[PDB]
């Protein structure tokens, strides 16, 4: 019982039936030509080897027909006519069916290999050239900090050609595997116990977003069932679905799990525009990586607007020079000296606070939240020194202080 | 005479490297800057650094240059082994220079590779073993052998990757086209080299007595004549190794040729006929027409619109629709060619509106499919 699989059964039937028929037919023709025509008293005969017959039958099955070798006994020629009628159908059906079966093997099998201490993020759900490029354009964006995270896609499909190109372009840090997060073996293949996080992506344009969110909940169930302590971030197309995954036994937003509910976010963004007309545009621009890139045909308002789009929001620790200021003085100092817009801080449990009043002192190793053109800008808030940098008017000069 | 020394150079280089890998694997089984080098080499061969894009451009050019040097050496030679002092043979000198570059590139790939063992068995590693060590034996003796060097034709199969790393294959159909053409041509050329080696060398188990002096070009022709199943028999193999190779070649390459030609014909058949743009004549009026455009609606329209009992008004009609026109409509358009035009596109795209110069059209007509399944949707 060694032919365990239907395709493998079909393969061995094809190969053996073809080879055994080809070999036996070559034997019959070899007998006919070397024996000669009996009704010519064996006078008409031709001394082929078995191997010349075997070659000649392949040259005729394929319809190549050189005529370097050919039959000349009447029994030989009549056998060649019968052989042509039968074996052209065999060869012409056999070769494509072998080519389909040998073409069936999965390319992106195998498993991810963990580098020494290097972080990786598993990504799954709706994986396509569109969703992957939209994701990677921001995720690998040049204006991010040089963080060595590797991206490990896991999906059931063979990747399309545009995606294969994109994967080859990012080959150093992006990987793809055939499989599904619904199978514990595939989770082991991508070593998800040792992944930094897992992202679950939704097909935003699906025919039923309740069905798509149900499928994505399953996934998170499967991922958490396999290992509870993975940071999972899941995209939800509907708000009402969220309550289900809040009930998962090891779902923990205090541990960093989260749901990006695009419906909740959309309606929140546009509702703030009812309070302050353009605010959805103000705020949406802060949350996407975008380089400032002027061109001289832009009007004043376009050059202004685009400078605004050149912002992202960033997070950095305040230097000890900020300690025991009020949030108001810290914001004044950031804006006036550092050219940074501080707007919120992490307050010791610990919690975010936005524009907090004079009663809130800054404390040592406070994380601050900033609007700026790069991570390189907010660094100034980490290096600032109230002796060593307090008059450095060429702000780009600020670096590690002696004081 | 001495050809087996050239062959042995590839086998000892292959085998010694494989043994060094196997004992190292076993020692590390029984018992940092490494990763920085691997990542740097990976970025370099991927064309991610500018020096990587330069290296990629050199791999591309020097593959083609090496292959042309092989065609020259295969064309202007008689016996497969040939005695000639290296200082006299100019092609054998630039061949060494290319083999040195390919040896450096081989080690750069080796550094970049995630598993050294599987890398030592990747196809291009065999091309390198079967070429570079022989090119050194070709200095150590006053002779050369046109042996496995024909495998240089496989280096062309890198080209679709290079034209991805240099990001010039921007479109899925164009990617598929260049993979098809290059894989077909590189396989055809390398197979012709292998048959050329077999027939000119002769059967080893007949002490090379059975041999046949084909040119490379006769082999290249003969493999096309057999891939296509045309089979003249003006040229044919007569070494037993040649004939057995022809049998294998038939089984493999009929499937290649018979799938390749239709897929090329589909891809080259895909280009849009009615592209381009309308050209505005001096002061002449034109009317853009769009929506439900068909031989039926266009003939119903034009029969009245161009009716002979109207005044002789010089208006030109410019159809704009997404479909390729049906044959009856192509006939009608050719009959009215002097004053009727058609363009592929839609009025939903500002570029197509510019193509038909609609700012300078006299009017635009939008036609409805009166027999549609929902007239609210059509409106
Ligand atoms: K034929």
Author numbering:
A (entry chain A): 214 to 561, 567 to 621
B (entry chain D): 14 to 44, 79 to 426
Describing publication, verbatim:
Mutant R2Q also led to active-like VSD structures, regardless of Ca2+ binding. However, R2Q VSD lacks direct coupling between S4 and S2 at residue R2-D142 as seen in the active VSD structures of R2Q and WT. Neutralization of either R2 or D142 resulted in the loss of a voltage-dependent S4-S2 coupling and reflected an increase in the activation energy to open the channel. Under apo conditions, the distance between residues N161 and E388 seen in the R1Q (4.3 Å) and R2Q (4.7 Å) variants is equivalent to the distance in the WT Mg2+ (4.3 Å between N161-E388) bound structure. In mutant R2Q, we expected to find a configuration in which the VSDs are active, but the channel is closed since this mutation impairs the coupling to the pore. In the R1Q (apo and Ca2+-bound), R2Q (apo and Ca2+-bound), and R3Q Ca2+-bound structures the S6 gate adopts an open conformation. The resolutions attained for each mutant were as follows: for R1Q, 2.7 Å in apo and 2.9 Å in Ca2+-bound conditions; for R2Q, 3.4 Å in apo and 2.9 Å in Ca2+-bound conditions; and for R3Q, 3.6 Å in apo and 2.6 Å in Ca2+-bound conditions.
The large-conductance calcium- and voltage-activated K+ channel (BK) plays a fundamental role in establishing negative feedback loops to control the firing patterns of neurons, transmitter release, insulin secretion, and smooth muscle contraction. BK channels comprise four identical α subunits (Slo1)2,3 with seven transmembrane segments (TMD) and a large C-terminal cytosolic domain (CTD). A voltage sensing domain (VSD, segments S0–S4) and a pore-gate domain (segments S5–S6) reside in the membrane. Additionally, two homologous regulators of the conductance of K+ domains (RCK) in each subunit (RCK1 and RCK2) assemble as a tetrameric gating ring (4× CTD) and serve as the cytoplasmic Ca2+ sensor.
